[PDB]
Design a protein around this ligand. Structure first.
Ligand code: RU
Ligand code: ZN
Length: 257
């Protein structure tokens, strides 16, 4: 099935998922001189105080930290969003080298990695129904650069040993995603898609301008994960990013002047 290799990678996805060549695919290059400040954007509200993480899963393409979304706890609202979007999971995309790994780019610049916090619109009842709607999802995207360690990330880093291979999971309760945020909530926003198959075009993207810094030791531990299952030949989980896709017609709006 789909992956990131030569024979099953982003160039192949369109065969099983024709939407891969659709009208609002993600990620995209953010051309900072084409994006326009939007005065009609409300302040962004990231409310992760009561976030309830459950566990971490290696799903054979990345790792997901999953949250209890059966109540309004960790929510995203404001900005370009109408209503309330509930945090369901987060994950990353990263490279084999520091010079690549992000999915969104900024004036063609690739970051070492990218964090995606996935939320679904509570008006639709649950995730499965939300992903049938054009405004079903909101994803908060955060760039990672290599520098100082991110203390909020170390708990994630430490557990990766226990989920080396596809299908492994571990208990991951009481993780606070507030520790993964940069200082500023300045952002770019555009309508897009999920960046993995089935590449559903349900996402309001909110991509933060300020990257977080993580240590070389932290990203290196990401790169020790496996795409393969236990007892299979080792395939390092690296370069699990989709490249930039055609913007076509879409406008990227900036929250800042
Ligand atoms: Ru997979
Ligand atoms: Zn993602």
């Amino acid at each position: 099935h789909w992956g990131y290799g030569k024979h099953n990678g982003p160039e192949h996805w369109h065969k099983d998922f024709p939407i891969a060549k659709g009208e609002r695919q993600s990620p995209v290059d953010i051309d900072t001189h084409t994006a326009k400040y939007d005065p009609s954007l409300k302040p962004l509200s990231v409310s992760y105080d009561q976030a309830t993480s459950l566990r971490i899963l290696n799903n054979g393409h990345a790792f997901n930290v999953e949250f209890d979304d059966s109540q309004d706890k960790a929510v995203l609202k404001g900005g370009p969003l109408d209503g309330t979007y509930r945090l369901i999971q987060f994950h990353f995309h990263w490279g084999s080298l520091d010079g690549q790994g992000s999915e969104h780019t900024v004036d063609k610049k690739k970051y070492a990695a990218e964090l995606h916090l996935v939320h679904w619109n509570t008006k639709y009842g649950d995730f499965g129904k939300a992903v049938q709607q054009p405004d079903g999802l909101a994803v908060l995207g955060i760039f990672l650069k290599v520098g100082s360690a991110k203390p909020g990330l170390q708990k994630v880093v430490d557990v990766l040993d226990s989920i080396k291979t596809k299908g492994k999971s571990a208990d991951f309760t009481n993780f606070d995603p507030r520790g993964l945020l940069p200082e500023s909530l300045d952002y770019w926003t555009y309508p897009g898609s999920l960046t993995t198959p089935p590449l559903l075009e349900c996402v309001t993207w909110i991509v933060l301008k300020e990257p977080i810094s993580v240590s070389s030791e932290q990203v290196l531990k990401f790169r020790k994960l496996n795409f393969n299952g236990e007892g299979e030949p080792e395939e390092l989980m690296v370069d699990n990013w989709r490249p930039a896709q055609p913007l076509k017609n879409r406008q990227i709006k900036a929250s800042f002047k």
